[PDB]
Structure 1
Amino acid sequence: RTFSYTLEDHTKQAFGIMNELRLSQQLCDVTLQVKYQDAPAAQFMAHKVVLASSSPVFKAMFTNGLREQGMEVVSIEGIHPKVMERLIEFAYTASISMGEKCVLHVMNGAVMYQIDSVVRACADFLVQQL
């Protein structure tokens, strides 16, 4: 006779640890350098495999069948640092939070990164405001 087991909380617990490693800057292999209009420059370190798991655009950007030695710097354009921050957090935690009046900027960043679940959620909000 065979024998299976599934831990239902596993992926949640594991993303908990991945987020701690991001915040401690351990095992990170990408730095996103975000410059937007005249807002001050910001950097966010991350794990390519986690970004790729949440965004088809990151996935295509990092999958070039001939990956670098370690730490890639990526220049990002036309998205505000706070918006990037919240999308990175979403990728690592499955949750996003914003004031009523950032929701459009967030949707703008989410479309650009093809993070479809948050595009949908923000679209729902905006329509309810009518």
Structure 2
Amino acid sequence: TFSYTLEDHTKQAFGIMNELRLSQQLCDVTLQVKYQDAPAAQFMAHKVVLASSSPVFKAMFTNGLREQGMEVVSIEGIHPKVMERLIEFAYTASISMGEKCVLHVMNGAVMYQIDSVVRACADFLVQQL
């Protein structure tokens, strides 16, 4: 038989998936993030991408129903900027923050079981010692 693999493929396809998110195309979930006194924010995304990067989103979205179109999800207890950075991680494989954001991002990463990000924020805080 003949077999071929493009190693860069998953990188490239996520690059296009991030473009479709920024263009709000093919999105099926709107995350409405309200945290304490911060202004409410909204993030549109694709459930299957969120599901691929967070076990908590996967279970949140996999239910027996064929949901029709655009589901709104109310998100509590995480700041808008943290959610934004986590969504960006799901779509880009990278995350960036100032040395004083690192703690709230781990909080959010623990809450959405983003294993990779938890391990990294823990390494950083320990190195600050």
For the criterion TM > 0.5, the same-fold answer is yes
Range into which the TM-score falls when normalised by the shorter chain: over 0.9
Consecutive unaligned residues of structure 2, counting only runs of 5 or more, are: none
- Deviation at 1:67? 2.7
> What CA RMSD, in Å, does the superposition of the two structures yield over aligned residues?
0.4
Aligned equivalents of 1:114, 1:41: Cα separation in 2: 23
Query: What corresponds to 1:3 in structure 2?
Result: 2
Deviation per CA, 1:84-114, whole angstroms, max 9, x where unpaired? Answer: 0000000000000000000000000000000
Q: Percent identity?
A: 100
TM-score (norm 1): 0.99
Q: 1-side partners of 2:90 and 2:76: how far apart?
A: 19
**Cα deviation code 1:43-83 (max 9, x no counterpart):** 00000000000000000000002131010000000000000
Write the distance in 1 (CA, Å) between the matches of 2:106 and 2:122. 7
Count of residue pairs the alignment pairs up? 129
Given the two structures, how large is their TM-score scaled by the length of structure 2? 0.99
SS in structure 1 opposite 2:33? Answer: strand
Secondary structure in 2 matching 1:39: coil
Q: Deviation of residue 117 (structure 1)?
A: 0.3
Structure 1, unpaired ranges of 5+: none
The equivalent of 1:96 in structure 2 is: 95
Q: Which runs of 4+ in 1 moved over 4 A?
A: none
